[PDB]
Amino acid sequence: PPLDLNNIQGDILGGLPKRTETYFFFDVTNVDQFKANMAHFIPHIKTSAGIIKDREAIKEHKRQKKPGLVPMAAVNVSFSHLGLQKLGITDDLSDNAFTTGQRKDAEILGDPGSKNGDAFTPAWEAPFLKDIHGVIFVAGDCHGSVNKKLDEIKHIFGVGTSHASISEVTHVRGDVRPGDVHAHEHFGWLDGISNPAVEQFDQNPLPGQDPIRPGFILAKENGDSRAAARPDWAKDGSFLTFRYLFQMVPEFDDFLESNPIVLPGLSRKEGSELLGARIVGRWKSGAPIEITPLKDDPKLAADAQRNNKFDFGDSLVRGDQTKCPFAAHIRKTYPRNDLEGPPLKADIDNRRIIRRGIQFGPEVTSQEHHDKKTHHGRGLLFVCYSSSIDDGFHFIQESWANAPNFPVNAVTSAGPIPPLDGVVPGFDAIIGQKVGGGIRQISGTNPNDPTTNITLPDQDFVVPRGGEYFFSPSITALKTKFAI
Numbered sequence: 001p002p003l004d005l006n007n008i009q010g011d012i013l014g015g016l017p018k019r020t021e022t023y024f025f026f027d028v029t030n031v032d033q034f035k036a037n038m039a040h041f042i043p044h045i046k047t048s049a050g051i052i053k054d055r056e057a058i059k060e061h062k063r064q065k066k067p068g069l070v071p072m073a074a075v076n077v078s079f080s081h082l083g084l085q086k087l088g089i090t091d092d093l094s095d096n097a098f099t100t101g102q103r104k105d106a107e108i109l110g111d112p113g114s115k116n117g118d119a120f121t122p123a124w125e126a127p128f129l130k131d132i133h134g135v136i137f138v139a140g141d142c143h144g145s146v147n148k149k150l151d152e153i154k155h156i157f158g159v160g161t162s163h164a165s166i167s168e169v170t171h172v173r174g175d176v177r178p179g180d181v182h183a184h185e186h187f188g189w190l191d192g193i194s195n196p197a198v199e200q201f202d203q204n205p206l207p208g209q210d211p212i213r214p215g216f217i218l219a220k221e222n223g224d225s226r227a228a229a230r231p232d233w234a235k236d237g238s239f240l241t242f243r244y245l246f247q248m249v250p251e252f253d254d255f256l257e258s259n260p261i262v263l264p265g266l267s268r269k270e271g272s273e274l275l276g277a278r279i280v281g282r283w284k285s286g287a288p289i290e291i292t293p294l295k296d297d298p299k300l301a302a303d304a305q306r307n308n309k310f311d312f313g314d315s316l317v318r319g320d321q322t323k324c325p326f327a328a329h330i331r332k333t334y335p336r337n338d339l340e341g342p343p344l345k346a347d348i349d350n351r352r353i354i355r356r357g358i359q360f361g362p363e364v365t366s367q368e369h370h371d372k373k374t375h376h377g378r379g380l381l382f383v384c385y386s387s388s389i390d391d392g393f394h395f396i397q398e399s400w401a402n403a404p405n406f407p408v409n410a411v412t413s414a415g416p417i418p419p420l421d422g423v424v425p426g427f428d429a430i431i432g433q434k435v436g437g438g439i440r441q442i443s444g445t446n447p448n449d450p451t452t453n454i455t456l457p458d459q460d461f462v463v464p465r466g467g468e469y470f471f472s473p474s475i476t477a478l479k480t481k482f483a484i
């Protein structure tokens with residue numbers, strides 16, 4: 001069937017274009033007044049149709065050399081399980097992670113925290129330990145637009161006044177980095193390269209971007225295995241995972257400088273760069289190591305038609321880590337042929353996620369660089385979408401990233417593979433977390449010596465400090481279940 005793009009919130013399919021973005025986390029205080037205000041709010045919501053239409057208007061305005069105008073920052077909205085309960089919307093959405101809420105789920109994600117008996121409290125910023133009912137987020141070209149748009153939303157809900165239907169728990173702000181590295185995350189890598197193409201939305205998949213069915217992103221659409229268990233209003237909504245991930249950049253840079261790979265043809269500097277590339281699965285530029293294993297290639301990196309056309313072939317079955325470690329970040333989170341090829345021939349479309357991350361915080365200072373220690377908060381506002389957090393984000397984090405035997409344990413489940421005997425890939429070095437904060441190791445990072453492990457510093461390079469699981473309903477769901 002064709003998708004109704006006027007019904008689907010625009011951050012999901014399309015993505016809200018942004019140099020800056022504010023996420024406003026709130027609690028409902030008066031349910032009836034909240035539902036009445038939502039009638040006024042809903043017309044402000046950007047849909048996927050809206051996105052495509054804007055993108056064309058920007059292209060014509062830009063082809064035509066006009067003086068370059070304010071993209072009326074787009075608004076989206078998303079609700080936690082605690083907010084659905086609060087609103088009287090009690091139909092089960094058949095996802096344990098969402099319904100559990102991420103404060104609890106975080107124990108199993110591997111977040112640092114502590115236990116009173118069987119009660120777990122993650123080591124998050126104080127506001128993310130309160131009940132959050134939803135998030136209103138607004139994304140645009142500059143601070144002026146976003147704030148102006150957000151002030152208007154706050155008038156609609158009466159924020160701060162005696163007649164208020166929501167209150168602020170906290171807010172967070174993302175900002176693309178300055179200049180040439182605007183799309184690079186704070187460790188230095190080009191981010192936003194690989195996302196799944198969606199059948200009946202993405203007209204021209206890029207090479208290496210196998211399109212998946214829309215029900216793996218949107219509830220009750222084609223390919224949602226849980227379609228029959230879900231209520232009609234859930235159609236064309238998607239689960240939004242938010243993770244407030246702080247990055248320890250000077251500690252990461254220092255880590256690389258201390259562990260250079262000694263390899264014919266490379267400086268000390270270059271061996272430290274090779275290690276970073278191998279840990280991520282790409283050069284900072286964006287060039288995938290599976291294509292260019294030993295030196296960066298900036299032209300390949302800048303070309304969307306060549307920079308994602310690889311699948312690890314049968315390197316895993318053969319035990320061959322020469323081009324790419326098994327435990328590289330991108331391989332841990334999208335295995336490609338490691339699982340889709342023999343022996344498993346597994347269908348991992350339900351493990352795919354659409355990422356809409358934005359960076360935050362200042363650049364690294366001279367003092368921070370000199371100390372080789374972090375002094376300011378910076379990192380990534382991580383946001384991803386799928387029709388199942390249980391199958392997507394949670395699983396990726398627990399069974400792949402945090403699992404030092406993955407992917408060997410997956411492919412050896414079918415029968416031992418002698419070239420993998422004794423291979424323990426190790427942790428995803430970027431996001432892998434060990435429960436209790438124990439010792440993490442990663443193997444295969446030296447092309448010439450695949451069995452040597454690096455023991456990671458106790459201070460993780462990425463440190464979660466907040467997050468929650470939300471559901472982003474359709475325009476029509478909002479209109480009938482959240483309005484009046």
Ligand code: HEM
Nearest residue numbers: 185189190191192193194245330333334380396397431462
């Ligand atoms: C500080 C945190 C993180 C950083 C710095 C980071 C960095 C990156 C980079 C540099 C890429 C490659 C460029 C691209 O394809 O976009 C990437 C891809 C990806 N990351 Fe992350 N990441 C982070 C957290 C996460 C988390 C929490 C998840 C999921 C639980 C995740 C899942 C993925 C996936 C699925 C891909 C795409 C794999 C592919 O299709 O090739 N990442 N990440």
